[PDB]
Amino acid sequence: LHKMSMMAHRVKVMPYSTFRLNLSVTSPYNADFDGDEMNLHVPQSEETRAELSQLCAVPLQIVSPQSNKPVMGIVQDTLCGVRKMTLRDTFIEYEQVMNMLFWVPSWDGVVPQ
Amino acid sequence: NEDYARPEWMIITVLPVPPPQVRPSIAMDETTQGQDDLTHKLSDILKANINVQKLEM
């Protein structure tokens, strides 16, 4: 029932018998993992594909026209924790502040003072 | 419309019989029947036609 009930994704072949989708792209389809199933369609023309990537790419969909506001945020664990990590009381030492910077792929390669 | 549909043709004289892809048959291997629904009321009609004429001659 949404323009977002269908979105174009980058394919990632992986093992195990299941479609593995990102969490933040959860509420658009409105799915959960208690058994929910998903349909997948495969473009076939060179343009068909393009039409799928230039207008239906998940990134283009982030701001929903129905309520002129985004429609995908940070859910559960990531949200809940992002809160903790923020409090003035939350401190991290070098050993971890490093393994943390490493996980950010775009990291400039510079540890902040 | 005098060209495409004249009042009279709302009554049928000669009946258009649709072909197989329309009323396909489904055989159970080889030596077993299997005929579509329409491929019957065509025959039911056909038979109700035969007898009629054989009462008018």
Partner: protein, 1070 residues
């Protein structure tokens, strides 16, 4: 008698009735009695019938005598567990095969004991109650507005009618007409207000006055005599006035029966002695009686139109056709066609015949499908009655039998009247929800007693018969009803009452009958009826010349040659139907009636135990009194979908699909009720070492992490069976099929897979490891060989050859497979806490506690806050103690166990008083800044494993008519791109992709005519020749690309004579 006592009473209950009482009890009632009364009524033919014989199971097959049959066989051979029927016919005789009910009376099982059964291969634990038609186990489903009762309804401002009273009538035994009585009341609450009523077969309506004179009452005031019972009630009487004027034109019984259109007058009578309020009796000399009713009715009407009595409550539950009854209304329909069949042989003999196949085959049809009403050009029946008994789990089967239906916003509701008789939680989500009810543990259905032994017992203890009544000499005369008939009134009743009630308690008027005294209206209800749900209660009676008390005492208890039959034959317990319930006062806790427990707030009866208002489903749910009710309702469904053991004989069963959990486990916490659900011996799951925490972030959104390591040690592994089956069809014209290992040989008609794993008998051996598509069976037709379902594979587990009634070769094959839990399979606890696997880590990777102990499962803390299911949290704690203490942890409903208590017990053992434990992150070993709710919780492994769903297609089997793909993943189908999916793409402005209905489905090249825009063209694609004679063309022709479904749309329209011309150029412009 304390609380812990009432349990032995309940134990006492099932020791004697057993979970499926209802089904059996109601069956025997059809065989034993009913069946007779049915054959003996409108029998005798211008040749009569007498007693009928009902033998035990038999198998009349050509090439053998008549083998005395048994359950477990008919099962394997797909037969029919039915026996013969004989009738002492008068001028001994065979008439049909009746399908018996397993575990009943004619079913040999009814006697055999423990050891006795193990030999018949029949699992002891199977409580039976089902039929076995053509193989598969069929379960008759209970079919639930009562009859013969007066109702008054107000009819909307827009209507010529003000109010109206109705009464649906039908003979409780004999044909059973479905014609209702309408006692209307024209003239809205203003206009200058008549009363007319509707009769069966009469075109228009008649003004009540005439209905009376036509009855046998000719003068006014003698008419008002019947309607109103108080000459000083001018209002009501006033109302009647205008009515009297209506009929003032017909002054006697002659004309009375006339105006109802010598020929006509005679028919008038008829519709009054056989159609008019036909219950009561359709005899003759009772005109009087019906008159007092039509009077009691016209009364009830006004009693409301004058704001003294509300409009009748349509959903007052107090106002179930089990198996036994169903066969009844069914049999009749049959035997009656046999009756008038035997009439034709007798109408040809110008000087054996009884085809006892209409009662055998007729019965089978119904029971087989689920369509009661015959067959023929009569689909105008009901499908559902009789289904395919569940066998996923034990608690699944129980549930299925204790099920109720209800032909189609208010009914679905959980009414008050539902207390005790039906389970509040167990009921299907979506679609039909509330139209399908399950019985509580204690509930039972009435069966059908006799009226007279109580009609008599009455008009000889104070019941001055209705026949001769005088409203004024007998003012406040308490009127009495019997099964909906008015058998006279009674003077001082207070005693008539506490005499019948003393009569039942000694057991001289079946404990099943209902007697309700409504002082607040002065009436006496008598019910023998068949289909009244009732529950049992302790009797209170202030019978204590030593105080203020339950008739039952701690001496009766410890005394439990003392069944439940005695607990009733001593007036210590009573069977209260929903109606009688209305006039009693029930005490909850027998006894009673701390800053931890739940705050707790004339008696005639006490509650055996509140935790008995639950049915099979909830009975397995721990602390259902601690979760959000809507959740309990869910688990109420998932249970019927977990794994376990559905019987023990399973190893000798040839049923398609069946799953057994490698290693079961009775729960660490249980319901006292489970004890009767044999649950401890047939668990639906295992006790997993849960751990509610966040980790990799793979236990997110109801997906759970499962410890691979222990998945290997066999945790939650399950066997999977399957049984493909085939026959060797023949023809009265000796042309038989074959079971061989075919190849070549002039035909080709063969499969793709291999036949090599086929010994020459056309079968595999039980050792063979089959897979992909490998031909499992080999049959031929002078190929008809069976292939292992494409998604499957495993190993053959048991092959078997056998005869058919028709001496044909019957062969079923069973394949086994061990199914391992995988990163996707679904699981769940007993709290609607369903979730699937997201990943699987091992011991190292797993988070842990100093002790070593590590979780088997890691569910997310997020599935708790809004689900509200807390009992879940409790079962864990409790079970973490029962784990350490070895003592069984009770989770049972409303008891005296608290969170504060258990927590103290857990502190005695060593761990945090709340469960939480320290844990060190399996990757680094550093402690977790937080603590976790680590504790053993029961988890059911619901069916629904990924690899049974995963499906992908690209150009596969195409349909025939349409030419589009085919449906379903099993037949290699393709997912539909239905409307809604269309829409979206259109929203995206994804023009081309959507257009790309063609490439992924239909598409097709048709050849149109440039002139008559049709698909005529005879395009012989080679020699180019195109043509289209009739339009005689070979020059102007076009080719187009449209969805074959559409090409078809057109061919179709044409054969209906409409002409869809297809033109390649616009001529109309714009």
């Amino acid at each position: 008698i304390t609380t812990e006592d009432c349990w032995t009473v309940i134990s006492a209950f099932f020791e004697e009735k057993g979970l499926v009482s209802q089904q059996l009890d109601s069956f025997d009632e059809f065989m034993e009695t009913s069946i007779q009364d049915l054959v003996w009524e409108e029998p005798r033919l211008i040749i009569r019938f007498g007693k009928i014989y009902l033998s035990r199971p038999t198998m009349t097959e050509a090439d053998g005598t008549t083998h005395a049959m048994f359950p477990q066989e008919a099962r394997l051979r797909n037969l029919t567990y039915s026996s013969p029927v004989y009738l002492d016919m008068e001028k001994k005789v065979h008439i049909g095969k009746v399908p018996i009910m397993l575990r009943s009376k004619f079913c040999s099982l009814r006697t055999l004991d423990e050891v006795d059964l193990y030999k018949m291969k029949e699992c002891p634990y199977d409580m039976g109650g089902y039929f076995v038609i053509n193989g598969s186990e069929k379960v008759l489903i209970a079919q639930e507005s009562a009859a013969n009762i007066v109702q008054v309804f107000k009819k909307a401002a827009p209507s010529p009618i003000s109010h109206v009273a109705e009464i649906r009538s039908a003979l409780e035994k004999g044909s059973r007409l479905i014609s209702t009585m309408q006692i209307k009341l024209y003239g809205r609450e203003d206009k200058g207000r008549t009363i007319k009523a509707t009769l069966p077969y009469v075109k228009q309506d008649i003004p009540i006055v005439i209905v009376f004179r036509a009855l046998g009452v000719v003068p006014d005031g003698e008419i008002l005599q019947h309607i109103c019972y108080d000459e000083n009630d001018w209002q009501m009487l006033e109302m009647l006035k205008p009515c009297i004027e209506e009929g003032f034109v017909i002054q006697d019984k002659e004309v009375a029966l006339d105006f109802i259109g010598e020929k006509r007058i005679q028919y008038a009578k008829d519709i009054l002695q056989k159609e008019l309020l036909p219950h009561i009796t359709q005899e003759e000399g009772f005109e009087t009686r019906k008159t007092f009713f039509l009077g009691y009715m016209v009364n009830r009407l006004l009693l409301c139109a004058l704001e003294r009595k509300d409009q009748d409550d349509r959903d007052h539950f107090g106002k179930l056709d089990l198996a036994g009854p169903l066969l009844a209304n069914l049999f009749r329909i049959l035997f009656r066609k046999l009756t008038r069949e035997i009439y034709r042989y007798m109408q040809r003999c110008i000087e054996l015949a009884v085809k006892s196949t209409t009662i055998t085959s007729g019965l089978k049809y119904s029971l087989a499908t689920g369509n009661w009403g015959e067959q023929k050009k009569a689909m105008s029946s009901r499908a559902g009655v009789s289904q395919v008994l569940n066998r996923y789990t034990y608690s699944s089967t129980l549930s299925h039998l204790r099920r109720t239906n209800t032909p189609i916003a208010k009914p679905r509701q959980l009414h008050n009247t539902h207390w005790g008789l039906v389970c509040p939680a167990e009921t299907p989500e979506g679609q039909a929800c509330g139209l399908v009810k399950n019985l509580s543990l204690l509930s039972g259905i009435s069966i059908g007693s006799p009226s007279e032994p109580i009609i008599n017992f009455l008009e000889e203890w104070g019941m001055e018969p209705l026949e001769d009544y005088d409203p004024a000499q007998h003012t406040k005369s308490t009127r009495i009803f019997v099964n909906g008939v008015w058998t006279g009134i009674h003077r001082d009743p207070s005693m008539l009452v506490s005499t019948m009630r003393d009569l039942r308690r000694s057991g001289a008027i079946s404990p099943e009958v209902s007697i309700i005294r409504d002082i607040r209206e002065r009436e006496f209800k008598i019910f023998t009826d068949v289909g009244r749900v009732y529950r049992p209660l302790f009797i209170v009676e202030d019978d204590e010349s030593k105080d203020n008390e339950l008739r039952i005492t701690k001496e009766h208890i410890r005394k439990i040659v003392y069944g439940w039959s005695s607990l009733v034959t001593s007036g210590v317990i009573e069977y209260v139907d929903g109606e009688e319930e209305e006039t009693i006062m029930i005490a909850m806790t027998p006894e009673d009636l701390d800053t931890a427990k739940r705050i707790k707030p004339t008696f005639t009866h006490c509650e055996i135990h509140p935790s008995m208002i639950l049915g099979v489903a909830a009975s397995i749910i721990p602390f259902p009194d601690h979760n959000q009710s809507p959740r309990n309702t869910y688990q109420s469904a998932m249970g019927k979908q977990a794994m376990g053991v559905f019987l023990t004989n399973y190893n000798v069963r040839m049923d398609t699909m069946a799953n057994i959990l490698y290693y079961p486990q009775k729960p660490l916490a249980k319901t006292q009720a489970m004890e009767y659900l044999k649950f401890r011996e047939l668990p639906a799951g295992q006790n997993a070492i849960v751990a509610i925490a966040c980790y990799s972030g793979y236990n997110q959104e109801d997906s759970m992490i499962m410890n691979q390591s222990s998945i290997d040690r066999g945790l939650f592994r399950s066997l999977f069976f399957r049984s493909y089956m085939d026959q060797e069809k023949r023809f009265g014209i000796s042309i038989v099929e074959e079971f061989e290992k075919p190849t070549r040989a002039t035909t080709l008609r063969l499969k793709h897979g291999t036949y090599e794993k086929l010994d020459e008998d056309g079968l595999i051996a039980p050792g063979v490891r089959v897979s992909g598509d490998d031909i499992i069976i080999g049959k031929t037709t002078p190929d008809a060989s069976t292939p292992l379902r494409s998604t499957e594979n495993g190993i053959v587990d048991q092959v078997l050859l056998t005869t058919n009634q028709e001496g044909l070769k019957f062969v079923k094959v069973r394949m086994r497979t061990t199914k391992v839990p995988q990163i996707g399979d679904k699981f769940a606890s007993r709290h609607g806490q369903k979730g699937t696997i997201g990943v699987t880590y091992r011991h190292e990777d797993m988070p842990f506690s100093a002790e070593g102990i590590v979780p088997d499962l890691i569910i997310n803390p997020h599935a708790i806050p809004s689900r509200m299911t807390v009992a879940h949290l409790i079962e864990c704690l409790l079970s973490k103690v029962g784990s350490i203490r070895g003592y069984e942890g009770d989770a049972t409903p409303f008891t005296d166990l608290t969170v504060d208590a258990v927590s103290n017990l857990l502190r005695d053992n060593g761990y945090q008083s709340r469960g939480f434990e320290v844990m060190y992150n399996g990757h680094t070993g550093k402690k977790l800044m937080a603590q976790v709710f680590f504790g053993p919780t029961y988890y059911q492994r619901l069916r629904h494993m990924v690899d049974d769903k995963i499906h992908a297609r690209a150009r596969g089997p195409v349909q025939v008519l349409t030419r589009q793909p085919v449906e379903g993943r099993s037949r290699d189908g393709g997912l539909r791109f239905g409307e809604m999916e269309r829409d979206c793409m259109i929203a995206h402005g994804a023009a081309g992709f959507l257009k790309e209905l063609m490439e992924a489905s239909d598409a097709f090249r048709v050849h149109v005519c440039g002139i008559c825009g049709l698909m005529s063209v005879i395009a012989n694609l080679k020699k180019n020749q195109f043509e289209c004679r009739s339009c005689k063309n070979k020059t102007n022709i076009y080719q187009l690309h449209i969805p074959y479904a559409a090409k078809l749309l057109f061919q179709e329209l044409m054969a209906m004579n409409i002409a869809p011309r297809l033109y390649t150029e616009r001529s109309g412009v714009s």
